[PDB]
Amino acid sequence: SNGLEDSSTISFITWNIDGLDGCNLPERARGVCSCLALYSPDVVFLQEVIPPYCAYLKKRAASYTIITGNEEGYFTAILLKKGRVKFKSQEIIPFPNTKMMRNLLCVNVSLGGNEFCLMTSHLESTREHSAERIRQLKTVLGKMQEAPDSTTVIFAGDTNLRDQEVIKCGGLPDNVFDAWEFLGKPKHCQYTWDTKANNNLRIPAAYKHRFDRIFFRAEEGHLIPQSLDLVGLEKLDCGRFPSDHWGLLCTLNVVL
Amino acid sequence: STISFITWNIDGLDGCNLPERARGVCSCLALYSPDVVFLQEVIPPYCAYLKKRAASYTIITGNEEGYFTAILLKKGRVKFKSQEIIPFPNTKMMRNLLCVNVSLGGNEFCLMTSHLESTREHSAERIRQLKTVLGKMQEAPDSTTVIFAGDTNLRDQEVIKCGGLPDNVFDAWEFLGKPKHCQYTWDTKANNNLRIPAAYKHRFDRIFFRAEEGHLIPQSLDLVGLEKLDCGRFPSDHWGLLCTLNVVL
Ligand SMILES: [Mg+2]
Ligand SMILES: [Mg+2]
């Protein structure tokens, strides 16, 4: 449980849970929920949620308030641990040129005696949509910069980024950091989508990417990543994983 | 005091109406009787045809199998001195750089052609090949006039990525003031050979030259091959370029 000693921390998971794959979806949702029960994160950032998946989450993850990025199709969601996180508002920023109904979902909350703006997105998919993905990244980073200086901004989501693309933007702006980079680029959680290790898409080839990423903007030294680890690497009863992506579990300390 | 030439990707890879289209190319060449013809996408039976139909030209080829370039040199006007083939080590499309050393009277030339790597997706390799071409153009003695004519598949931004043409290498179309009437050499609005139901146009076919100041002066540039044949298609999906130049001492 979250005691006094652990009160300066925020923990979260971000995970594209592949709700577009209808096969074995209820069992796979139960697998995601088992992971949430194991770690009891304060916040969960999800991508590729669909409406019946919301019902699975209400059943097996009932301690979370669910905020969604849309009502129909597939969309992102932010889950907030009841009793820990106080919800203040939700904002949705459009991506006017998306061809995949993507957008930027933000929720303003209070947690641990601190004000946060929590953001997620599922940026335009595939190599061929690089230009639009880069435009969306700019929208995300601009929104991170625009937040009031007092609030702690955390983005976590499925960026679909290739390393060359971040550079095409000129890189993360000066007060914005990537949690994996901050922690010294640890190899154990570098790749979040890996067709050698994960067979869910049935791709007969071996490719791996760091698609899922965490960005944060805080006043100097005020937000310090403590750990980053993969989740969802256990096969379920059906012999498949919860998703084609691995999830990321992150803890950060909010410091005076 | 002149040299005249045509450069033309004649699409030997399109087997449909190929015999009629090859005869169409040559009917076209017969109208202009150029000193030199640079061809791309020649295939072996097309080459066999040219060896008979164009027996009045010396025919130099870039390969013997698949598809390849050729340079045709008018006998009695052009003295053939040597050929050189330079590989593009990373081509995935058997492309290369074909060069011939020739003389027209007292004037020595190095004439070059290539069919640079095709498609937007192969931009990086195409740029590497362009660099190989430009490097080679610099190698000739200063008194030798160097002309490259071929299907470059270039986008203008790719030439910028390359660093631009060097100060001593000129594009004949640019030299002539960027005339609009012969700008685009591949145009799916005007050319139906690929049955592309949309309008796209590119200046893929280009002419570069290096000559001592004022010793090679482009005079004209025109598109050729714009007449539909009996079968209702064109000799190629590309138009050819006919260029006339003076060599002025
Ligand atoms: Mg997916
Ligand atoms: Mg072609």
Side-chain angles (χ1 to χ4, degrees):
Chain A
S1 295
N2 248 41
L4 173 49
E5 174 174 350
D6 312 326
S7 296
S8 81
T9 71
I10 179 172
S11 67
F12 63 85
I13 287 167
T14 182
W15 204 349
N16 176 325
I17 50 63
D18 196 8
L20 293 177
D21 179 13
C23 201
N24 310 108
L25 189 60
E27 173 181 324
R28 287 167 39 229
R30 185 165 168 167
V32 169
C33 288
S34 295
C35 176
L36 304 189
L38 176 58
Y39 296 109
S40 195
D42 301 319
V43 177
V44 189
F45 304 89
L46 299 176
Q47 307 84 38
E48 294 195 32
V49 182
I50 61 167
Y53 204 102
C54 289
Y56 305 148
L57 288 171
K58 286 164 185 306
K59 176 171 177 61
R60 310 279 179 146
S63 66
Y64 293 91
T65 297
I66 301 169
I67 295 94
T68 60
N70 255 326
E71 330 190 3
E72 309 295 351
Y74 69 102
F75 42 81
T76 59
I78 298 182
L79 276 58
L80 308 175
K81 175 67 77 167
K82 293 170 184 187
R84 282 188 215 159
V85 178
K86 165 149 54 76
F87 171 74
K88 300 195 291 176
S89 70
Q90 58 164 98
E91 313 178 70
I92 299 171
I93 284 72
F95 292 160
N97 298 314
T98 183
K99 294 178 194 299
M100 305 179 191
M101 297 297 287
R102 311 303 175 74
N103 61 19
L104 174 59
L105 170 62
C106 311
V107 296
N108 302 287
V109 303
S110 305
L111 165 72
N114 286 286
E115 312 310 319
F116 292 84
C117 181
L118 308 172
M119 306 168 54
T120 193
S121 186
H122 180 191
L123 306 186
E124 211 81 348
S125 307
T126 86
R127 174 158 69 78
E128 286 67 36
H129 290 112
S130 184
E132 169 66 11
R133 165 166 59 254
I134 287 165
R135 289 193 293 260
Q136 296 170 3
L137 176 61
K138 294 170 157 292
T139 298
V140 169
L141 297 171
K143 180 58 172 178
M144 292 184 75
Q145 291 176 303
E146 286 160 350
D149 295 323
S150 57
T151 93
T152 296
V153 180
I154 298 170
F155 170 92
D158 179 6
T159 71
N160 273 305
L161 288 163
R162 278 77 176 164
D163 283 12
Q164 284 304 323
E165 296 176 334
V166 174
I167 299 164
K168 282 184 69 61
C169 301
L172 293 183
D174 278 352
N175 52 349
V176 175
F177 304 91
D178 174 314
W180 175 75
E181 289 183 350
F182 182 99
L183 290 167
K185 301 186 178 176
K187 296 185 186 315
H188 71 281
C189 62
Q190 178 171 1
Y191 300 107
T192 64
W193 186 89
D194 176 353
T195 64
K196 189 189 167 179
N198 187 302
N199 60 340
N200 275 38
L201 291 170
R202 313 187 216 271
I203 293 167
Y207 292 98
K208 59 200 185 173
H209 287 275
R210 192 169 74 89
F211 284 154
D212 303 275
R213 302 190 182 196
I214 295 159
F215 308 140
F216 64 94
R217 183 219 74 167
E219 277 185 30
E220 299 288 4
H222 288 349
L223 189 63
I224 304 176
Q226 297 298 300
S227 67
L228 189 60
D229 293 293
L230 301 175
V231 295
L233 277 77
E234 300 78 30
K235 285 184 178 178
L236 303 176
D237 288 347
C238 65
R240 309 176 71 223
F241 299 96
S243 174
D244 64 313
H245 297 242
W246 309 139
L248 286 172
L249 169 68
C250 187
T251 63
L252 310 88
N253 282 353
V254 183
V255 180
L256 290 178
Chain B
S1 68
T2 89
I3 189 171
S4 59
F5 71 80
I6 286 175
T7 182
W8 205 351
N9 178 323
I10 51 61
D11 199 6
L13 288 175
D14 176 19
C16 296
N17 313 108
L18 188 57
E20 170 174 332
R21 286 169 39 238
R23 300 189 292 262
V25 165
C26 286
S27 300
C28 188
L29 300 173
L31 180 56
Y32 305 114
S33 302
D35 295 318
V36 178
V37 185
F38 303 93
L39 297 176
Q40 306 85 40
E41 298 194 32
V42 182
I43 56 167
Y46 204 118
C47 188
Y49 170 71
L50 292 172
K51 286 171 171 164
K52 292 167 70 170
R53 182 76 170 94
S56 46
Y57 288 74
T58 299
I59 301 176
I60 307 303
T61 56
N63 244 321
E64 70 172 76
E65 306 276 62
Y67 64 103
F68 45 83
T69 59
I71 301 179
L72 286 60
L73 307 170
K74 187 192 294 179
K75 297 173 179 176
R77 274 285 278 171
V78 185
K79 178 180 175 189
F80 171 65
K81 298 189 148 159
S82 68
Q83 64 170 82
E84 183 174 18
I85 297 171
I86 294 162
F88 293 152
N90 300 122
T91 183
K92 294 171 180 179
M93 308 180 189
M94 296 302 300
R95 311 304 175 73
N96 59 20
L97 178 57
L98 171 61
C99 310
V100 294
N101 286 349
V102 308
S103 82
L104 289 80
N107 307 329
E108 291 294 294
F109 288 78
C110 178
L111 304 178
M112 301 166 52
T113 196
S114 188
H115 179 192
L116 300 192
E117 211 85 347
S118 305
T119 80
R120 185 175 192 72
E121 186 55 23
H122 295 114
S123 181
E125 172 61 14
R126 171 165 55 253
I127 289 167
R128 289 192 298 261
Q129 294 173 4
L130 177 57
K131 288 175 174 295
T132 298
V133 171
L134 296 171
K136 182 59 176 191
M137 291 188 69
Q138 298 296 338
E139 289 187 18
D142 294 345
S143 57
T144 296
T145 296
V146 186
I147 300 173
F148 172 89
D151 179 7
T152 71
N153 275 297
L154 285 164
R155 285 71 171 161
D156 284 5
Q157 199 63 47
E158 289 170 344
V159 178
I160 293 171
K161 261 169 150 287
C162 231
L165 296 176
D167 289 345
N168 67 337
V169 176
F170 300 87
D171 177 307
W173 177 76
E174 294 184 348
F175 182 99
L176 288 165
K178 300 181 174 175
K180 294 176 172 49
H181 70 265
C182 61
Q183 177 169 3
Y184 299 108
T185 65
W186 190 89
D187 177 357
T188 61
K189 193 192 183 192
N191 189 299
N192 64 334
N193 277 33
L194 284 165
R195 303 157 272 92
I196 292 168
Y200 294 98
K201 58 192 185 309
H202 287 273
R203 186 168 78 88
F204 281 155
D205 302 274
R206 306 189 179 199
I207 296 155
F208 309 140
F209 68 95
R210 192 212 75 179
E212 298 195 61
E213 312 95 290
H215 284 39
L216 187 68
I217 309 175
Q219 296 299 325
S220 72
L221 189 63
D222 291 279
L223 295 172
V224 298
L226 276 79
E227 173 168 344
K228 263 178 177 169
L229 307 173
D230 269 23
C231 65
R233 304 173 75 229
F234 298 93
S236 171
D237 61 314
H238 294 246
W239 309 134
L241 287 170
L242 171 67
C243 185
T244 72
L245 313 92
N246 293 332
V247 169
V248 171
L249 301 160

